[PDB]
Design a protein around this ligand. Structure first.
Ligand code: CL
Ligand code: CL
Ligand code: CL
Ligand code: CL
Lengths: 173, 173, 173, 173
């Protein structure tokens, strides 16, 4: 480009791939959120938690697209695969799937950071450090805290514990 | 000193010892607080309770140091031993350890009050009565109230009770 | 851990070591502060300067502990050695000791940054860059500015200069 | 009296003696204050410091008189001796005389506390602890801090140091 400088084709392509991963994650969270709004699941706080994450992941994709243009690369969109499940089980099952999803996004961020470091692209590396790495660490810690609280509440009364977690930890309304 | 009056070497030394005990207690509460912030423990209200106590105990040490100087004694600092445990078990185990810790500080306050009385040092005795004795009694009563509520919640569903205590009694977010 | 990702045992251990160093530094500043509150030293602005630094260093330790948990490592506390001196001499002597202390913390930060870089741990590296490296550079510059002003004020009237520095540069009030 | 209870003649008399000592001290501070307002001394901050202390000492006498009546004793006033000096020398000389005066009041408070303790008069003991003992300790610490700063400022330029202390430490504006 007329503005492109120190921006490799390898980073440009990995950025487009990462946009796809973030949009896939956003779509997964849309499905999780609406599952918990089903009349036969009915856990409002869990629904809201996952709908909020759908928006957060979309915003990540949007920031990557802004950056792609700021650097002179070209956004390229690919098909977005549907989420891995149509029904997400219990809050525990869903929170486990979300932590798996987030670890996968985190590894993709770390892989892209390493590519940027290898390509001597400090703007890329700073961008990820400033807007993605700590955001992801914070979210994974929150999800782990949630998992431990959900697990402690299973005991021998799973329904009671799932209700109490939704009412007393998750935001509702 | 040019200001020292009615201030025995015995009281001066016991004051320095008490500073060490309060800082040791503060450090114990720092460890308790961060244990409960672990992703595999995740009891925010318990963490906050103990972090608040770390600050309270530090403030006690600071008041003793201010007083030492007001009286013309000389602060002398010693090594601070690490807390007695690296992992603190359940909320019940932790609250039991805290009550044991507080009873030990209380006995040290009472011992110092008795030394002051024996040395006819009424400023020392008033200082402890005004800023430490009732504060400690109030805290031990609160901890006993907490212990009884934690114990009543164990029954046959320990995880459920530990979650409910943290959510409905301890401050969180 | 269930959340731990890209977090080496080497970094986890060095983080615990750094917490010990920050708490040791905090304790050193507590001793410096109270020394200057002695009736036979009586330099309020110097006392306040060092008590403020005790709090700053504690806050550094607290941030490291928060981060340790965010990453899935485990805080491990060790004994805290007492400060290197019981009496700190003149304001000049104290400011010299503080700059030596700060350079030692700075080198520990740089060493940990290098370990993080070697381990491809960009979250660690960003954390130090964002919350510690510049804070330390700013503080060392301030301390050097203070040292030069204290030194210029010694001349042939040391007491006069020590009073004037405390009154016209250091905060009191 | 119709209200007197647990109030010994020994305490009643010592209270009257202590009123005399506080009024004597108040008169000493009036003389110190006006000395420093002389056109050939002219240290406004020193004058104000001592005039404020004249009022503080009077207020102590007034509290003792209120208490004497609250307890059913009878105030008995005696002649008030003039201060020990007509001219008070330098700020250093004056601050030294004031610390000597305050130590004498402090010992009288401690002696009265001991008499009250010996007579099992806890209202007397509490009264002194609540309104006199710590007030006196705080004031003596302030005076010692002042003495150390005045002494550090003497060096080889006494006039310069006396001016700077009055301008930068004592209240004026
Ligand atoms: Cl296609
Ligand atoms: Cl040692
Ligand atoms: Cl050990
Ligand atoms: Cl007469």
């Amino acid at each position: 480009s007329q503005i492109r400088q120190n921006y490799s084709t390898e980073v440009e392509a990995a950025v487009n791939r990462l946009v796809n991963l973030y949009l896939r994650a956003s779509y997964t969270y849309l499905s999780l959120g609406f599952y918990f709004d089903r009349d036969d699941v009915a856990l409002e706080g869990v629904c809201h938690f996952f709908r909020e994450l759908a928006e957060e992941k979309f915003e990540g994709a949007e920031r990557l697209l802004k950056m792609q243009n700021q650097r002179g690369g070209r956004a390229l969109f690919q098909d977005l695969q549907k989420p891995s499940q149509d029904e997400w089980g219990t809050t525990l099952d869903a929170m486990k799937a979300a932590i798996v999803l987030e670890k996968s996004l985190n590894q993709a961020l770390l892989d892209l950071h390493a590519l940027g470091s290898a390509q001597a692209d400090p703007h890329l590396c700073d961008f990820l450090e400033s807007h993605f790495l700590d955001e992801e660490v914070k979210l994974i810690k929150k999800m782990g805290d949630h998992l431990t609280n959900i697990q402690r509440l299973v005991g021998s009364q799973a329904g009671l514990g799932e209700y109490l977690f939704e009412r007393l930890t998750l935001k509702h309304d």
